C-alpha cells in the first residue's frame, strides 16, 4: 500500500510521522497536528488558514460577492471526527490512485521531485530553500526542519476551491524555473461535483442538475498533476491562456482558460495549445534544466549536515534524469528531457486517469459544473480503493451506476445547484 499506516486522527503524536508542525508562511501560527503518510508527503486535516495571510479566516465575503461555483461552511472540518474521516478519505484516494499503473507512475515522479536546493547565493555551495520545509516538533519540544514535496490540506473559506498553493521566492519563480517548490493542495474528499452525461448539456450553463458525480480520485489526481508540474518547475505561467472560441457561452463573456489547465486535463483540450507556443515552452524549460545542471556543476560544497553533496547531486540527477559524463559533469540530454517533460505533461493528465479508473467524468475542462454534493467515501459499503462508487457485484457495478446520483442517491446529498447562476 502507498500508505503503510492506517492513521486515526486521535493517535498519539510521536514527533516523526504524527506530529505538531508549523509551515513557513512568513507569519505566526499555532502548531497543527499533521500526518506523514508516505516519504515526502504529509496531510494536515485542517482548513487552510495558513498558506495565505489574507485568507486566515473562514469568513465569507459579502453575500453575493463571490463566484457561482463556491460553497461556504465555516464549521466544516472543525471536529475530531471530521478530521479523522478527512484523513481516512485522503488516504483512501491515494491508494485508489496508487492502485493504477498511471497513479503509481505519477506518485513515484512526485516523490522523486524534491524541490531543488537553490537557496545559496554562493555558486560554489548547494543550499536548501527553507520554504520547501516544515518545522516538526520533536519529542523534546524542539523544532527540526524537514524537507517535503507535498502536503494535502483542507480548503480555505471556499470549501470547493481546490488548488495547489506554494510559497514563492523574492526573485525566483520556483514553479516555472525548473527548481520546484513544496506543494500544498487545498482539497476535500468530503464533497464532489455533479456533471452531465450529454456533452451539449454539460457545456451549457443553463442546463443540467448534475446527474453524475465526479469520482474524487480524479479530482485529487488533477491537483497531483498540477503538483507534478510545479515540483519539476515546469508549470505554464497562468498569464498564458486560451481565449476560448469553441463555446459561445465562454466566448460571449471573454472567458480565458490557462494553458496549464488545458494541459492538465489533456485529451482534446490539450490541442488548443498551438505547436508554436508548445515548442516555446519546451525549449524554455529545457534551458531551465540546463541551468540546474550548470548550478550542480559549480557546487563544490554542501550547506548543512543532513546529507552529503554527493547524495544531493545524485538526488537531482535522478529527478531531472541528467547525464553524468566521464568528467563527472552533469548535462541535460535532449531525449531524456523530452521523455520526462512529456511524461509529466502528456502522460499524467486527467483524461488518462479517467481511462484508468474506468469512471464517467466531464469530457472537457471547458464545461459548466452543475452542483456540489456532500459524500462519504470512507465506508467500504460506499466507496472502495478498487471500484470507487461503482462497487463490483452489486447494482452499482455497471453503467457507472455508482456515480449516478439518482440511482445511488443514498451516497449523495446535493448542497447547491450552480446551473442558471452563471
Amino acid at each position: 500500500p502507498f500508505v503503510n499506516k492506517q492513521f486515526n486522527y486521535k493517535d498519539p503524536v510521536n514527533g516523526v510521522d504524527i506530529a505538531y508542525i508549523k509551515i513557513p508562511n512568513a507569519g505566526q501560527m499555532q502548531p497543527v497536528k499533521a500526518f506523514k503518510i508516505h516519504n515526502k508527503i504529509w496531510v494536515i486535516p485542517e482548513r487552510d488558514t495558513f498558506t495565505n495571510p489574507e485568507e486566515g479566516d473562514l469568513n465569507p465575503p459579502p453575500e453575493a460577492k463571490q463566484v457561482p461555483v463556491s460553497y461556504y461552511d465555516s464549521t466544516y472540518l472543525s471536529t475530531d471526527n471530521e478530521k479523522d474521516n478527512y484523513l481516512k478519505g485522503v488516504t483512501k484516494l491515494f491508494e485508489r490512485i496508487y492502485s493504477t499503473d498511471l497513479g503509481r507512475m505519477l506518485l513515484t515522479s512526485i516523490v522523486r521531485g524534491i524541490p531543488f536546493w537553490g537557496g545559496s547565493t554562493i555558486d560554489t555551495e548547494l543550499k536548501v530553500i527553507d520554504t520547501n520545509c516544515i518545522n516538526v516538533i520533536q519529542p523534546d519540544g524542539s523544532y527540526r526542519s524537514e524537507e517535503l514535496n507535498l502536503v494535502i490540506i483542507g480548503p480555505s473559506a471556499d470549501i470547493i476551491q481546490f488548488e495547489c498553493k506554494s510559497f514563492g521566492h523574492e526573485v525566483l519563480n520556483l514553479t516555472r524555473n525548473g527548481y520546484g517548490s513544496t506543494q500544498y493542495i487545498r482539497f476535500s474528499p468530503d464533497f464532489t461535483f455533479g456533471f452531465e452525461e450529454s456533452l451539449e448539456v454539460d457545456t451549457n450553463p443553463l442546463l443540467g442538475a448534475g446527474k453524475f458525480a465526479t469520482d474524487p480520485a480524479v479530482t485529487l489526481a488533477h491537483e497531483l498533476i498540477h503538483a507534478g508540474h510545479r515540483l519539476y518547475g515546469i508549470a505554464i505561467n497562468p498569464n498564458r491562456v486560451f481565449k476560448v472560441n469553441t463555446n459561445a457561452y465562454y466566448e460571449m463573456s471573454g472567458l480565458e482558460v490557462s494553458f496549464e489547465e488545458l494541459r492538465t486535463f489533456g485529451g482534446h483540450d490539450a490541442k488548443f495549445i498551438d505547436s508554436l507556443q508548445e515548442n516555446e515552452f519546451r525549449l524554455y524549460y529545457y534551458n531551465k534544466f540546463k541551468d540546474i545542471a550548470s548550478t550542480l556543476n559549480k557546487a563544490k560544497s554542501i550547506v548543512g549536515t543532513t546529507a552529503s553533496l554527493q547524495y544531493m547531486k545524485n538526488v537531482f540527477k535522478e529527478k531531472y534524469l541528467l547525464s553524468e559524463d566521464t568528467s563527472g559533469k552533469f548535462s541535460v540530454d535532449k531525449l531524456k528531457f523530452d521523455k520526462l517533460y512529456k511524461m509529466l505533461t502528456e502522460i499524467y493528465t486527467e483524461d488518462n486517469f479517467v481511462k484508468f479508473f474506468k469512471v464517467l467524468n466531464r469530457k472537457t475542462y471547458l464545461n459548466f459544473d452543475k452542483a456540489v454534493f456532500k459524500i462519504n467515501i470512507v465506508p467500504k459499503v460506499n466507496y472502495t480503493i478498487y471500484d470507487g462508487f461503482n462497487l463490483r457485484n452489486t447494482n452499482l457495478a455497471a453503467n457507472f451506476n455508482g456515480q449516478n446520483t439518482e440511482i445511488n442517491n443514498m451516497n449523495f446529498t446535493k448542497l447547491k445547484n450552480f446551473t442558471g447562476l452563471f
Binding site: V69, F162, E163, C164, L255, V257, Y365, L366
Partner: peptide, 4 residues
Amino acid sequence: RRFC
C-alpha cells in the same frame, strides 16, 4: 483548479 477548476474554472467553471
